[PDB]
Symmetry: C4
Subunit: 263 residues, 4 copies
């Protein structure tokens, strides 16, 4: 009553498709392993953010919408660039670094003790450098003035923008926690769900905040544009609050042993 697995096909069963941080135990603090993790975060964050920056540049060449109105097709395009861009980046780098590609996601995972603090700082630094490189590349590669930096819009105040950014980032981070960090038959598929979470968070936030949801995404274009709005802090504090909210929900479920009827 077992189905035969041919020896040439055993790798597709034995080689689990799991985030790299699930297997960062003893031995992980070598220079080699720190470099692997940094290289995954650099490559992944660069390709995700470069892609999404060029896509936003293009989408923002659409004719202006009167009276401050929204442009649904434009918003869909930009959300695809970030949502599908992160999906591809995370699928590529999942077994390299785990594909965080976002200092707020790394923060949630350090709070959850999925990633130790020093490795987490290395990853976050890498993501921010990658975002600076992506912004510089996207600027160099496109004509016109930079149109992919974050700014308030749509009549949103700074306070509203802070809360939009926090709850959007929370959705993203809770997705990573429940699909990638939690170990089950759907862990392999987490990069898909993470990408859809980011897609959604962009449909919520682009019109009002530009959609930061990721300090590395917001910092790099500000550097490249040589321009920091005085409300730039919302793109740091909002995602940090969202990481903590997501962690807090996950932690409650872990204390409750959520997945088991009779612990």
């Amino acid at each position: 009553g077992q189905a035969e697995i041919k020896p040439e096909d055993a790798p597709y069963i034995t080689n689990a498709y799991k985030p790299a941080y699930a297997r960062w135990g003893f031995g992980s603090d070598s220079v080699r392993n720190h470099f692997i993790a940094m290289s995954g975060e650099f490559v992944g964050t660069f390709l995700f953010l470069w892609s999404a920056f060029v896509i936003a540049q293009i989408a923002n060449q659409a004719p202006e919408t009167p009276d401050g109105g929204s442009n649904p097709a434009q918003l869909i395009m930009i959300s695809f660039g970030f949502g599908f861009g992160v999906m591809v980046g995370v699928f590529i780098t999942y077994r390299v670094s785990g594909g965080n590609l976002n200092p707020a996601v790394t923060l949630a995972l350090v709070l959850a003790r999925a990633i130790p603090p020093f490795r987490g700082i290395l990853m976050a630094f890498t993501q921010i450098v990658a975002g600076m490189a992506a912004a510089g590349a996207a600027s160099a590669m496109t004509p016109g003035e930079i149109a992919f930096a974050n700014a308030l819009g749509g009549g949103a105040s700074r306070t509203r923008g802070l809360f939009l950014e926090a709850f959007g980032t929370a959705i993203l981070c809770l997705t990573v926690l429940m699909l990638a960090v939690e170990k089950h038959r759907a862990t392999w598929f987490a990069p898909f769900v993470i990408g859809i979470a980011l897609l959604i968070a962009h449909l919520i936030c682009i019109y009002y905040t530009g959609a930061g949801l990721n300090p590395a995404r917001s910092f790099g274009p500000a550097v490249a544009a040589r321009s920091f709005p005085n409300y730039h802090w919302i793109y740091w504090l909002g995602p940090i609050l969202g990481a903590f909210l997501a962690y807090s929900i996950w932690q409650m479920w872990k204390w409750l042993n959520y997945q088991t009827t009779n612990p």
Copy 2:
């Protein structure tokens, strides 16, 4: 002829990705387990409906279409917010509560005896409170008048709207029954299919009814807007009829032992 599973990778095989209601047997009536289920429905319904309400708010800032015409890009955006929003919510909460996020889905599952009536009532109450919280949050977070409450449009009568809502809800509930409640190799993937079902149901209904398809989705914005149209009942009776239709089809297939050639 078996492929080796390394002990560190056994959790990805042994921990099934299955809806929580599949494992609610003896022991389930503890306060702990009722609270777990309520917390999954609250978190999931809040994040799904909050997201989708803000997305609809934004989409409804598009310039008006003349002569009552439709705006396909706008309709696509809103359908993404509800369809992908529910997808993310259900993937997050699948092993917490099963991710119903909708009193009509809970009703279908109580009729199918997947969920017992008292737990079902607790879940439905939770969903309605979550929808009120989401509406209040989305209103507080966005400028302008609320634009995410349901209303008839597109020249549709109340009777047409009732039938559109019933058949759209039936599609959703039959999806949950056949992909999540029925146990097979695709059960793990049900949250994806459920989200696409809801996406479709929004492309059918937004233009004509606003797309309720979920009494908790329709009630909360009416509370927040301090406004109930006299036809609000279609957003309760239509989804209830759809739950019964879906249940009736599933029940026929169960009586027939559909999946087996020679019972």
Copy 3:
């Protein structure tokens, strides 16, 4: 070196998610089994085509595009209704009838000897009745004149339309053959790929032919509109040619034992 499967989780492994026709051997010619198959095709085809007809009705209320031009957002909406509509229908009915939902797909599968001719005729008749019911329901449920019947457009001739319909249907049928009929680790996922194939085929065909790709989809609206264009035959012959082309490619690969390096 094996991972434990808890007895309550064995159904998710032992109950394969496979099309019903894979298991239609001895015993299949009972009235019960013919009725099961017909009921799957009726329910699936009705929900798919009803959904997609209402979605097309709505999309076709968009303001007219000047000079015969195309409207990409409108075309995307309609393609979503048919592509995601068929995806949901096939996922629901996969283990009931196999989810053909299309006489041309049934024809390809009768040529491939996946489905015997008498059962195939029963299924095709059912699909055509379902399409008539869906058209009548969609008409009854929506205001205005029917806008979901097929017609030539975009400057396309009948001959061009015949070839567009044939090659689009071939893509669909080759997808079913290679993902659902062929037995492998991705068979379970065929409903997804089938839906994307149909999505693509609609982006190819709507503007020029209305996108028939399915005689049951084309016949029912003509009945409901009390209107058959003299070129209606392209919506029968084109899909029949496409079924044969797909079958011919698959048959060549089967003769070649494509999947095996050293037969």
Copy 4:
């Protein structure tokens, strides 16, 4: 503690859904096996590029956007045609040829030693002939002048276009390497990720270069239009550079034994 697999269901476990090149060992140099591989690349590339060419033809009938601006809905439609078109093609041909459908992808895989050079040349030649056939068919099937040939736009220079094409092709090729060539539990799903990578690469490139990303995609329409721009070379050199960049990253990760904490 094992779940029963019924003998009729063993094929869905034993028949791995893996790219054909994973199993091209001894015996592969027969005429039969060369023909199988060529037939997969021909069928797959023809259906992908034919589909996407007709879709682009249609999308390019949209009313002109003033002042050189972008049209997000149009760009989304075209990206769907190539991204979902390649997805369907690769799912169909995965176990036939591996579904490269692109000389630059074949080049990356020859550099990675996944495909030997002579077979690789045969595949690339086939892809280019398929692209010529697809262009000729799409032209013959549609009214109007050909609108699916690549050209610079959006104010992009040749140098910018070369770099956009190189980095977009790199994303595609790194996706193939890390999801299809690398052997793990997600290899079966690589056709999905490959299609999303191509979707993204089109949202980056269409507006500025037309999106070549594939010498067979760029050559065939130039032949059919009897028109080669003097910058046509960017559609060869850009994808070749991208293949090398992707290979270089993958090779670094292979030298590092990326997937293992303690080699």
